[PDB]
């Protein structure tokens, strides 16, 4: 052990790589971007049957037009959410408009860069990288529906579909086959629910898994338990009949 | 500051280890007073007894401490505790309740445990105090910043040995004079020296002020310790 921002001989940052490892141990989070909205789903993964599952917040509202899903050391995600909300509200204060989704993501990624001391060229107020990744989903007038993956490396990518966390290698391959540009919101809802069902260690019901989406017309919504239950009737019957 | 794989704090552990080599201090709380007795660490004939105080310190008129550990660390802490007591007096026009002063002192210790990469203070304290909420009180604090209340307690060397003896003879209905005896007997039994002579002791009481309605701290002159070592029959 020597430094927190040392390069390996290959040219990579040790601590950045390992934080990426903390994310692989997280619950699963999946997002799919259609042309009728963007769905975001997560594995709740209660550590005991005595834990009250609806107290598990892994999907949060950032603004009316932007939601996000987390995977990893989820406590690290509080200050990122706080920052994201402030940036969006502030942007609306300064400019009387909605912040673009891409701009919001870039701001969360700038925050993530701030580990160290002030790295001789400015100032870093945080001792390690974040141990959590985010899927950032929303709508804006320039670019429509969008899905971003924000990493503790401060890089972000847009994705037609994306999975993060423990089941992510497997879920991603699945998404590579199922995703096409044409999907309805309902088709995409079902796909998230299907792919979570595959990779989860319990039987997926309306307590260990959570759904949400964002549409231009209704904003960002976290579906209540009764609604998801009725989509889980619906998936069961669609597959049992195929 | 760092944690061990066991979830223990090295530097704190090692500071407690250091304290177990220091002279034993004993505190006993009775119903009408408190006793503080301490053993001075292997002395010499030439050491000035008449102008010495290494183990017993006055915090205000109603609170005293017995020290086990590095004296120099203790003086740092004692001084801040004295200031803290006066701030309280100035703010509220009331003498500081014993617990409050103990808690503040403990919090300063806890701090060194958690941030700043300085070493902890190698000090353990027994506080002897009176206030009008809880009457007579005895508390202990160690380098971790933890503190606890007691009817009788010891710190420094042979605490385990001294604690068992106190457990045995301690009774709730005790007068201070019985506590005086108990403390001297317990140090006598647990010394690593021939006998417990006056020149190796510090002794203090917090009584109900002879005949008054008021609280008085008596810090024993060497002469008094020699005389009180007579009564209890250890010559």
């Amino acid at each position: 052990d020597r430094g927190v921002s040392t390069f390996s001989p290959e040219g990579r940052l040790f601590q950045v790589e390992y934080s990426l490892e903390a994310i692989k141990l997280g619950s699963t989070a999946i997002g799919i971007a259609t042309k009728e909205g963007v769905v975001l789903g997560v594995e709740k993964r209660a550590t005991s049957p005595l834990l009250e599952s609806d107290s598990i917040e892994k999907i949060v509202e950032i603004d009316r037009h932007i939601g996000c899903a987390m995977s990893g050391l989820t406590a690290d995600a509080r200050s990122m959410i706080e920052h994201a909300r402030t940036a969006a509200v502030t942007h609306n204060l300064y400019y009387d408009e909605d912040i673009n989704v891409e701009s919001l993501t870039q701001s969360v990624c700038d925050l993530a860069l701030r580990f160290g001391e002030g790295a001789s060229g400015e100032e870093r107020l945080m001792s390690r990288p974040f141990g959590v990744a985010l899927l950032i989903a929303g709508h804006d007038a320039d670019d429509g529906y969008q899905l971003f993956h924000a990493e503790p490396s401060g890089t972000f990518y847009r994705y037609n579909a994306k999975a993060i966390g423990s089941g992510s290698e497997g879920a991603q391959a699945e998404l590579l086959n199922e995703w096409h540009s044409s999907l309805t919101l309902k088709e995409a809802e079902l796909l998230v629910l299907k792919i979570l069902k595959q990779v989860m260690e319990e039987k997926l019901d309306e307590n260990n898994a959570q759904l949400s989406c964002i549409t231009k017309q209704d904003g960002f919504k976290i579906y209540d338990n009764e609604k998801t239950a009725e989509l889980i009737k619906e998936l069961k019957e669609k597959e049992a009949a195929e | 500051t760092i944690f061990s794989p066991e979830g223990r704090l090295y530097q704190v552990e090692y500071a407690l280890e250091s304290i177990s080599h220091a002279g034993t201090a004993i505190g006993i709380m009775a119903s009408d007073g408190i006793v503080l007795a301490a053993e001075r660490k292997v002395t010499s004939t030439l050491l000035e007894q008449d102008t010495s105080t290494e183990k017993l310190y006055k915090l205000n008129d109603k609170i005293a401490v017995a020290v086990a550990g590095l004296t120099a660390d203790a003086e740092i802490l004692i001084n801040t505790a004295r200031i803290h007591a006066q701030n309280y007096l100035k703010t509220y026009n009331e003498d500081i309740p014993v617990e409050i002063l103990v808690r503040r002192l403990s919090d300063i210790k806890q701090g060194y445990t958690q941030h700043g990469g300085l070493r902890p203070f190698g000090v353990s304290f027994i506080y002897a105090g009176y206030d009008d909420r809880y009457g007579y009180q005895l508390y202990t604090s160690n380098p971790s910043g933890n503190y606890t209340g007691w009817k009788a307690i010891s710190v420094g060397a042979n605490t385990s040995a001294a604690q068992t003896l106190l457990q045995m003879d301690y009774k709730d209905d005790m007068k201070v004079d019985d506590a005086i005896e108990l403390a001297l007997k317990t140090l006598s039994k647990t010394t690593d020296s021939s006998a417990l002579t006056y020149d190796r002791l510090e002794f203090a009481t917090i009584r109900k002020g002879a005949n008054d309605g008021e609280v008085y701290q008596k810090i024993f002159k060497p002469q008094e310790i020699k005389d009180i070592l007579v009564k209890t029959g250890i010559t």
Binding site: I62, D63, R85, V89, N92, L93 | -
Partner: protein
């Protein structure tokens, strides 16, 4: 400026003029003195135009932030206290604002808070604020009953701003009217004093100090 808000049987009436002045110059007749903070919260503005517009827009931002943080709408009490506490930080720097925070929540019921730049914050059933306040108070107080219909209460509010627009050189333009309910503000229109005065004179048979 004249602004008022009062509580009655069927909620809250909020009414404001729309005149902006610098000295004796009439800067605008069409200024917006109500801020719709959220669907259940209104802010009224008197004093420094900029001071009011800026800090009440800002208050909107802070209110939205509370919603995201607490997954619940901010209480009238707490929204008003944010603005109160901000303004108090600035005491003695020359901020100039008289303000009403008006809204509904389940827990509070319909509520009005008056907040000014001296730092005063009061809860009450009736407030008139601005250079025209005394005029508004005269009409409002002498015709106010708790049990007024919604229709009448809307009229009285409308009629009190008109009173003030007429007598106070620094009020006028138009009335902007709002009703706040359980559900909860509803806009009851912009009414130009130009037309409203003659119409009220005709129909009510009042304003007899006026030739014509």
């Amino acid at each position: 400026t004249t602004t008022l808000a009062f509580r009655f049987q069927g909620g809250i009436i909020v009414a404001v003029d729309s005149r902006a002045t610098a000295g004796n110059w009439v800067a605008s007749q069409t200024v917006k003195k109500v801020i719709e903070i959220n669907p259940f919260l209104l802010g009224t503005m008197a004093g420094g135009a900029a001071d009011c517009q800026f800090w009440e827009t800002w208050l909107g931002s802070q209110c939205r932030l509370h919603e995201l943080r607490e997954k619940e709408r901010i209480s009238v009490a707490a929204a008003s206290k944010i603005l109160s506490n901000l303004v108090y930080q600035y005491k003695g720097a020359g901020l100039s604002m008289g303000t009403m925070i008006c809204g509904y929540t389940r827990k509070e019921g319909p509520t009005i808070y008056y907040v000014d730049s001296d730092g005063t914050r009061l809860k009450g059933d009736i407030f008139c604020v601005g250079s025209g306040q005394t005029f508004a108070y005269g009409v409002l107080d002498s015709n106010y009953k708790w049990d007024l219909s919604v229709e009448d209460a809307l009229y009285l509010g409308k009629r009190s701003i008109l009173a003030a627009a007429h007598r106070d050189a620094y009020s006028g333009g138009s009335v902007n009217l709002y009703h706040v309910t359980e559900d909860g503000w509803i806009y009851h229109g912009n009414h130009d004093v130009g037309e409203l005065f003659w119409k009220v004179k005709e129909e009510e048979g009042s304003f007899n100090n006026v030739i014509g």
